[PDB]
Design a protein around this ligand. Structure first.
Ligand SMILES: O=C(O)c1cnc2c([N+](=O)[O-])cccc2c1O
Length: 438
């Protein structure tokens, strides 16, 4: 495979469904490189657990933790790290209310080169235990020889886009990593970077982030096919924000409009949203506690019941993960019979205005509250017109894309309800014998 898209290992499925999966210990093993320094961008950290995932010989190398915590949460994280002299912290600035640092990324500096890992898991035991999570692994990027002048840039502009993303933090500890990236050759990268950073973007900066970044890439590097209006859009996420009183406020007006872009020329396109039902969570490997990582509140949900008609159950027989609740987020554009896809995106961005951006000031300004990061797989970047869908995720032409859940997605039944984490479920017990009482 040329895609280097992996799922995390799931405890409890048969070995066939973990064969090509990765645990964090595998990512940090010496087989992937001789570690000199690393940067861990994330939302939630368990520092004691994290350090034990590094191999013993690497546990004293410098680690930078990039986080968004403030006030007491920030103090708690500093206290967690205090015992480990080699750990530094970088607080990402969040100057817009209700912003979060959701980006999940590792920068791994080796003796032999550099690797970038963009993924969806928090750095806590439970996120790597029985969840469906996604990982993109970069190639080993070699160092550019001292005295040599070359860009080290890929046809997807990944090196410049990653530096641009890091420059948005305006942070001294990340300027060091920017200088490291400058000195490496990233020309073999075949994915496009799609990031969100907080701010209000107009003019030449409007296309840099969020769903306008996606729109711009799809206009420039995908081609429209006849009957494009028949190719659905699929979104798959672990959390939903407040989208407004109806679909025309944001979901189908600006979000779906960005996602249905193809090619340069100027809607009944179906929209499938995949989000775990209550039954999905109850019968999961973790049981109801899996819902602790699916933070859809009743307050938000009650304001947008129109949205739930779009919801489809989580099903993942193709990867043996129907009972491993998703914390991956993915977006893609399948053909009407779901045998091909025009593109695939894996990201930290949930279905929310905070992450993807919302238009302001008479449509002239895109406002984003949070940091997010994902990678976009475009057929043109692999010399193809479209991707064939792999029929079994862990099965064996390597030009077929490993989609991790079942297609077509299955609509909620009439008795199904979206998982809502702050109401009780006491009618039927979960796989551990328990109810859910918030
Ligand atoms: O991975 C993330 O980016 C992320 C962010 N926030 C979460 C919350 N929360 O408090 O919003 C509750 C539960 C799980 C969360 C999570 O998994």
């Amino acid at each position: 495979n040329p895609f280097q898209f992996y799922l995390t290992r799931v405890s409890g499925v048969k070995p066939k469904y973990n064969s090509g999966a990765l645990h964090i210990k595998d990512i940090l093993s010496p087989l992937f490189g001789t570690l000199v320094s690393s940067a861990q961008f994330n939302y939630c950290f368990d520092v004691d657990w994290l350090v034990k995932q590094y191999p013993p010989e690497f546990r004293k190398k410098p680690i930078l933790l990039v986080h968004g915590d403030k006030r007491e949460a920030k103090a708690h994280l500093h206290a967690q790290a205090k015992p480990y002299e080699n750990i530094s912290l970088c607080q990402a600035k969040l100057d817009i209310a209700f912003g979060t640092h959701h980006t999940k990324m590792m920068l791994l500096l080796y003796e032999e080169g550099l690797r970038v890992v963009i993924h969806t898991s928090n750095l806590i035991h439970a996120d790597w235990h029985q969840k469906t999570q996604g990982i993109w692994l970069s190639p080993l990027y070699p160092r550019i020889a001292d005295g040599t002048h070359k860009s080290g840039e890929s046809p997807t502009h990944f090196k410049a886009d990653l530096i641009s993303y890091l420059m948005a933090y305006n942070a001294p500890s990340l300027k060091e990593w920017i200088d490291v990236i400058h000195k490496h050759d990233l020309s073999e990268t075949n994915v496009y970077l799609i990031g969100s950073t907080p701010g209000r973007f107009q003019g030449s900066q409007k296309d840099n982030w969020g769903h306008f970044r996606l729109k711009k890439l799809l206009k420039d590097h995908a081609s429209s096919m006849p009957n494009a209006e028949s190719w659905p859009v699929v979104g798959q996420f672990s959390s939903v924000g407040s989208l407004g009183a109806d679909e025309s406020k944001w979901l189908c007006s600006e979000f779906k409009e960005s996602m249905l872009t193809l090619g340069k020329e100027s809607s009944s396109v179906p929209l499938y949203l995949i989000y775990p039902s209550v039954e999905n969570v109850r019968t999961s490997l973790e049981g109801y506690p899996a819902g602790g990582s699916l933070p859809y509140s009743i307050q938000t949900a009650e304001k947008q019941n129109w949205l739930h008609s779009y919801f489809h159950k989580w099903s993942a027989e193709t990867s043996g993960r129907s009972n491993a609740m998703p914390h991956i987020k993915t977006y893609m554009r399948p053909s009407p019979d779901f045998s091909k896809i025009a593109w695939f995106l894996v990201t930290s961005a949930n279905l929310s205005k905070a992450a993807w951006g919302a238009l302001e000031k008479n449509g002239t300004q895109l406002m984003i509250r949070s940091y997010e990061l994902g990678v976009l797989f475009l057929p043109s970047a692999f010399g193809l017109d479209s991707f064939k869908v792999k029929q079994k995720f862990f099965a064996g032409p390597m030009a077929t894309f490993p989609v991790p859940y079942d297609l077509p997605p299955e609509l909620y039944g009439s008795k199904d309800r979206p998982w809502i984490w702050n109401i009780p479920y006491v009618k039927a017990p979960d796989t551990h014998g328990n109810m859910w009482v918030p």
